[PDB]
Nucleic acid binder design. Structure first.
Ligand SMILES: [Mn+2]
Ligand SMILES: [Mn+2]
Ligand SMILES: [Mn+2]
Ligand SMILES: [Mn+2]
Ligand SMILES: [Mn+2]
Ligand SMILES: [Mn+2]
Ligand code: NA
Length: 326
DNA sequence: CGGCCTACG
DNA sequence: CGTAG
DNA sequence: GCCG
């Protein structure tokens, strides 16, 4: 088992679901306390289990696995022997965990804001609604739409949404294309939002595109909320039988020269991409982001025509999106 | 021990 | 500060 | 919390 998640296939469904979910609770809780290092170790340990070919049945099967030390091994041991880990359950029921989870779920609220509200004594959404002058416009939108935004987006919803985005994109710039990214591109059947990547085959034609797209979607009455720019974090009105629901949609524009890097970055998973950027820098001495791959010694950017090119540049076996579910 | 991804709005 | 994978 |  290699130490970096980008070095091994990780399928969407696997054989250690219960174990990985428990470690991800501890990862999430570490994030709420500002310990990004502990969050990373628990996320990485969970991801190792997702990549295994069969269920872990005995503690002995953890020896030699990367990111399993005393703490993560004790969690698994308690789950194997008792079906529950007391630490995990204590986190689950804790007021701190439940409230930080509730608050950070709000669009416009991060860990730092949620923690401040927690220290001020706030605990519920209605607490926040009874003091609305303290909220940003973004947070007000996130709170008004919170119920709809807590409802999973179905892959069945995504097709209809892509065609309306394509219509606006085609008026904004004929020939421009829309690609579904994020978790749906990795094969998820549900998600918390829809992610789209927009480009145009003629380099430079994409300049100034996203404002033109947003104006057109807004004129169609489809935009419930949005803030030159190249990323837009929106709330869209999506049809429903006899009504509609609010859905989070992210739109990103990239020049076609950067498209493989943007496709790779926006297809995720989040942990996969953090691990891939870490691997690039620490093992290969190259700097990766969603715009390109930089050699800081020769002062040059790698040209990529495909995701396959990027894996080759980095000396990694190619993984299709459905094996990037770290 | 230091490091932990790397951007844009 | 928020947001993205 | 774990790697290297
Ligand atoms: Mn170990
Ligand atoms: Mn026991
Ligand atoms: Mn998504
Ligand atoms: Mn998104
Ligand atoms: Mn850019
Ligand atoms: Mn996210
Ligand atoms: Na949030």
């Amino acid at each position: 088992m290699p130490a970096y998640a980008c070095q091994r296939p990780t399928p969407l469904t696997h054989h250690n679901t219960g174990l990985s979910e428990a470690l991800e609770i501890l990862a999430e809780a570490a994030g709420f306390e500002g310990s990004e290092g502990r969050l990373l170790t628990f996320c990485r340990a969970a991801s190792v289990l997702k990549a295994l070919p069969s269920p872990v049945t005995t503690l002995s099967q953890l020896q030699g696995l990367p990111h399993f030390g005393e703490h993560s091994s004790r969690v698994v041991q308690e789950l194997l022997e008792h079906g529950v880990c007391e630490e995990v359950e204590r986190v689950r029921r804790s007021e701190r965990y439940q409230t930080m989870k509730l608050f950070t779920q709000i669009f416009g609220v991060g860990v730092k804001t949620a923690d401040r509200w927690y220290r001020e004594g706030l605990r519920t959404l209605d607490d926040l609604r009874e003091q609305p002058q303290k909220l940003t416009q973004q947070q007000k939108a996130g709170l008004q739409h919170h119920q709809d935004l807590s409802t999973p987006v179905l892959r069945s919803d995504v097709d209809a949404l892509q065609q309306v985005v394509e219509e606006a994109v085609g008026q904004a710039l004929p020939g421009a294309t829309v690609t579904l990214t994020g978790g749906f591109r990795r094969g998820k059947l549900q998600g918390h939002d829809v992610d789209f990547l927009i480009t145009h085959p003629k380099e430079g034609q994409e300049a100034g595109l996203l404002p033109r797209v947003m104006c057109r979607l807004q004129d169609q009455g489809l935009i419930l909320y949005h803030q030159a720019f190249e990323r837009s974090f929106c709330i869209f009105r999506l049809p429903q039988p006899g009504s509609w629901k609010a859905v989070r949609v992210d739109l990103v524009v990239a020049p076609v020269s950067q498209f493989p890097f943007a496709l790779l970055g926006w297809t995720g998973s989040k942990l996969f991409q953090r691990e891939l950027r870490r691997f690039s820098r620490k093992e290969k001495g190259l700097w990766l982001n969603s715009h390109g791959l930089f050699d800081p010694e020769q002062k040059t950017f790698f040209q990529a025509a495909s995701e396959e090119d990027i894996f080759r540049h980095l000396g990694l076996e190619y993984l299709p999106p459905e094996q990037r579910n770290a």
